[PDB]
């Protein structure tokens, strides 16, 4: 309830700021002023053309490493279990495999960007 009111207040304040910024000043837009910005001249191609991604392999690994966070965040609560020896074995197992996966991608030159 209060978080909804807070979010609404923040979004409304930002929107009113945009509205003020767009309706208070004197607008004079003509074709040359709104043209795309290159440093001095006109662009050759488009900004919508494909832009090659040299770290594409690290990005996919980020998805798999991100989900290893969902497995480790309940660890503060798991420390309150009675049988700590099986919990600590499983928590360390979950991090050794995460370390071994990082080591594997490192040694196979997976962490290097495409040249």
């Amino acid at each position: 309830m209060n978080i909804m009111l807070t979010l609404l207040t923040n979004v409304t304040l930002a929107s009113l700021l945009v509205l003020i910024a767009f309706w208070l000043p004197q607008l004079n837009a003509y074709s040359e002023k709104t043209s795309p910005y290159e440093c001095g001249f006109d662009p050759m191609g488009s900004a919508r053309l494909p832009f090659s991604m040299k770290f594409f392999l690290v990005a996919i690994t980020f998805l798999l490493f991100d989900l290893e966070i969902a497995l480790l965040l309940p660890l503060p609560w798991a420390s309150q279990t009675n049988n700590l020896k099986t919990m600590l074995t499983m928590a360390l197992f979950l991090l050794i495999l995460l370390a071994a996966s990082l080591a594997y991608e490192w040694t196979q030159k997976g962490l290097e960007w495409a040249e």
């Binding site: 991604m53 594409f56 309940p74 660890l75 099986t86 919990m87 996966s101 991608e105």
Partner: protein, 175 residues
């Protein structure tokens, strides 16, 4: 019928699914799925699953960042399509919207079977539990039991993640 908040959130969930279901460019499909993830986080917050909602929101935010990178790299065109820039995309979008509205109308007005069996509505507050117990939270204890009870699940999941890293390496090797 009490402030309709769960109803509104689920309706926005379906609207976002229709938005990205239309396939009106990856950049906007990612926006639609992000909106759906946020409203789903809210839906499961309203039922007491705060950890699960926050975590799924976080996971999908990361995934959609990766998808945005990949869309600018390999899934782009000269004129990316928005929901009103193409007849097929707009038609699918409005068809999904009208289907959602139609099933909502035929559910709120009459209790007639759609696919599985006819429901009631009445507000999803009716089916709650009156549960007065605990100085802990049930969801957090259940999730934390992944290390004390779910040894087998941890083993299979960790193996799958290591294998997935190896698999992406092998697939993108090339040659």
């Amino acid at each position: 019928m009490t402030m309709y908040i769960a109803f509104i959130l689920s309706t926005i969930f379906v609207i976002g699914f229709v938005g990205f279901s239309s396939k009106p460019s990856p950049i906007y499909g990612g926006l639609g799925l992000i909106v759906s993830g946020g409203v789903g986080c809210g839906i499961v917050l309203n039922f007491g699953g705060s950890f699960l909602g926050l975590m799924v929101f976080l996971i999908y935010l990361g995934g959609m960042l990766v998808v945005f990178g990949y869309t600018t790299a390999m899934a782009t065109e000269m004129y990316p399509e928005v929901w009103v820039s193409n007849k097929t995309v707009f038609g699918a979008f409005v068809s999904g919207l009208m289907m959602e509205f139609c099933m909502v109308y035929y559910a709120l007005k009459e209790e007639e079977v759609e696919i599985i069996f006819k429901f009631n509505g009445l507000g999803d507050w009716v089916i709650y539990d009156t549960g007065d117990s605990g100085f802990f939270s049930e969801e957090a204890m259940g999730i934390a039991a992944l290390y004390s009870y779910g040894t087998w699940l941890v083993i299979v999941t960790g193996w799958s993640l290591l294998i997935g890293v190896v698999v992406i390496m092998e697939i993108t090797r090339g040659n």
